[PDB]
DNA sequence: AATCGGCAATGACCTTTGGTCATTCAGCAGAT
């Protein structure tokens, strides 16, 4: 594989895990996708924990993603992110 | 997050009216108040602008529409520190004045195109002719153009102007918000304009079309899949019900105001 | 057939006329060619009259040369000239 | 003509030391005396240069090597009025208006050196200020048309490594004194022999006989044989640079004609130069 | 008579206290 191709494939897994999660029933408890849609600043270690607790394995990716790799993902999607 | 999208939040380019070569980059939700802080009429001004021989300062340009204080504070850092800002998506982690007005413009032009900030619901304002001239001079030499979505507006004196014509509150959307409160208080939301599903009161995030006289509501996640008909953050879009064009930023301002700023709304509607 | 080419062919007749004339036997009385080589400022109507007094006919050009054409030729040759 | 090729005749670029924007274009055979005229130490100066607010003036650059006073006056008029000067070979017949800027002088001077009417003249460009020389180099770098390598562009900035600048430019024929002395001995005693090109004997007094410029070399030739040898280019009349068939030394056509016209038409400036 | 482009002068900076860099910010002379 290519180092920028291992990324483009990883990033589609994070995307699919994020956009296919159920939408909120309580509007005060938005999903990670809806938090991005409303420009909620994303706390990196929280989304990283979420992706690494079944959501990646759900969308067919066996492997733990790194917090800074989730940060790369947010920057590439214009998604506001920050460390904790 | 507990707060709604702010009424106004800006990253501004401050310049001395005495030495034009002296510049300074900052952020504020209240451009007029902060300018008074720089000019010594109100306590709290920065250390660079404290110098007596440089007062008074002026705000020659600013970018607005930042959907959070964090978003503005990050754009402000990347604009103040161009030599440290890495614009390739990265796993990463007084004020020295900018070199020139031409470098601020080139780095501002760069920042509005890099993936970190490319899709933010921003807008550039120019308040002096010669600063806007250097901007147009750089834009014309550049090959990669800016988003048509990214409005770049001017407000020159002559013919309340400048930062003193910028609304510091939610009055510009007050009509849209009033439409929103009455549609949802009387449960007139109907079905999602996209998926055609009934939207019971309190069932997830239901976003409202920004065009006046139209009552089209949809699930937040449906509205975004429609504008984007890969990519996550929508920018511009068209309402399927009324056919009107919409900015994704304005639709989120009202949604977060209705969902997280109920006290801000009642004060707006007075 | 051409106005840029006939002016080139005319200038070849002037060149050959100047260049092939016999050289001065008295160094105080140089030929027109030797005046140019020594950067004598060339009085146009003088060289003009000389070319039309048998020189162009000698090198095979029937027709009269105009002083402006002789002026064009000099300037094309870096030969310094003047009007009397 | 009647007179020999002048020792020095120049076209200069005058600039004020009080305002660098004020420029002026002139010609003179005596750059030092003409500067003193501009600055009011000697009578005979210009009217544009009469403002004592603008004085002192200075000559920041000049073009030398003009073989006629007419040749300088022509080049000076073209450099003064670039908007009137037709550079296409044309059948046609003092800046009271100062030039726009130094960049425009640099740009137009660069053009005048490349056009047919002045291209093959035995000229030489002098630069006496670093900033005027930098504007010139900035233009030459951008331009794709090079000046001919045959044409020299020299500098003389103050100090380094005395009379410098225009005061270092010789006003008489002393730079070629040996060459002129070599010619007199050669021809006064009939040592010219035969033409190095056509191999024909050259009796004393038989036409114009030009002499190789290199020290200690004998080469004499028929004037029109030298040129045919030098030009052995495309279409040309005026030689520029050549090589002596006897000593193999490189020559400039302008230097050789300066001695020819001295020996031929300037016999009394010869005797003053040799003090004979 | 008001403009005008290009210069000469000036200020700020971060100390290498002066060589950078920028500006024309209530300028400036000169030319049209
Ligand atoms: Ca206006
Ligand atoms: Ca015939
Ligand atoms: Zn829906
Ligand atoms: Zn609508
Ligand atoms: Zn011969
Ligand atoms: Zn020789």
Author numbering:
A (entry chain D), C (entry chain B): 842 to 925
B (entry chain C): 4 to 96, 109 to 174, 197 to 266, 271 to 311
D (entry chain A): 4 to 96, 108 to 175, 196 to 266, 269 to 312
The authors write:
SLX1 belongs to the GIY-YIG superfamily of nucleases. When bound to SLX4, SLX1 cleaves various branched DNA substrates near the branch point. Slx1 comprises two distinct domains: N-terminal GIY-YIG nuclease domain and C-terminal RING domain which binds two zinc ions. The CCD3 fragment of Slx4 bound between these two domains.
Crystals of Tt-Slx1–Slx4CCD3 that were grown in the presence of splayed-arm substrate belonged to the P21 space group. These crystals diffracted to a resolution of 2.7 Å. Unexpectedly, the DNA substrate, which was designed to adopt a splayed-arm conformation, was found to form a double-helical conformation, in which the two single-stranded overhangs were base-paired because of partial complementarity, forming a slightly distorted double helix with a 2-nt bulge and a G-A mismatch. The asymmetric unit of Tt-Slx1–Slx4CCD3-DNA crystals contained one DNA molecule that was bound by two protein molecules. The DNA-binding interface in each protein was identical and located on the side of the GIY-YIG domain at the edge of the central β-sheet. The protein bound the DNA backbone through basic amino acid side chains (R22, H23, R51, R54, K101 and R102) with a buried surface area of 637.3 Å2 in the better-organized protein–DNA interface. In the new Tt-Slx1–Slx4CCD3-DNA structure, the DNA was located away from the active site and occupied a markedly different position from the position that we predicted earlier. We designated this newly identified DNA-binding surface as site III. Therefore, upon DNA binding at site III, a part of this region that comprised residues 108–113 became ordered. We hypothesize that the ordering of this region is coupled to the proper assembly of the active site, which could serve as a safety latch mechanism (i.e. catalysis could only occur when DNA is bound at site III).
